[PDB]
Amino acid sequence: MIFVKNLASVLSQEWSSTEKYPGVRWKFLIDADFDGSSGLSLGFAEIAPGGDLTLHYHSPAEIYVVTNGKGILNKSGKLETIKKGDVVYIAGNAEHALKNNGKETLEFYWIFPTDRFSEVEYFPAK
Which span sits near a second copy by CB under 8 A: 12-20, 45-53, 70-78, 118-126?
Answer: 70-78
Q: Report in angstroms the alpha-carbon separations of 118 from 20, 39, 82.
A: 17, 14, 27
Report in angstroms how near the CB of residue 37 gets to a second copy at its nearest: 5
Provide, rounded to whole angstroms, the least separation between the CB of residue 116 and a second copy.
13
Check the annotation: does 56 bind a ligand: yes
- Site size toward Mn ion, by CB under 5 A: 1
Tell me which of 48, 63, 72, 120 binds a second copy, using CB under 8 A: 63
Applying CB under 8 A, does 11 fall inside the site for a second copy? no
DSSP single-letter state for residue 36: -
Question: Residue 34 is inside which H or E element, if any?
Answer: helix 32-35
Q: Which of 7, 3, 5 is nearest to 107 (CA)?
A: 7
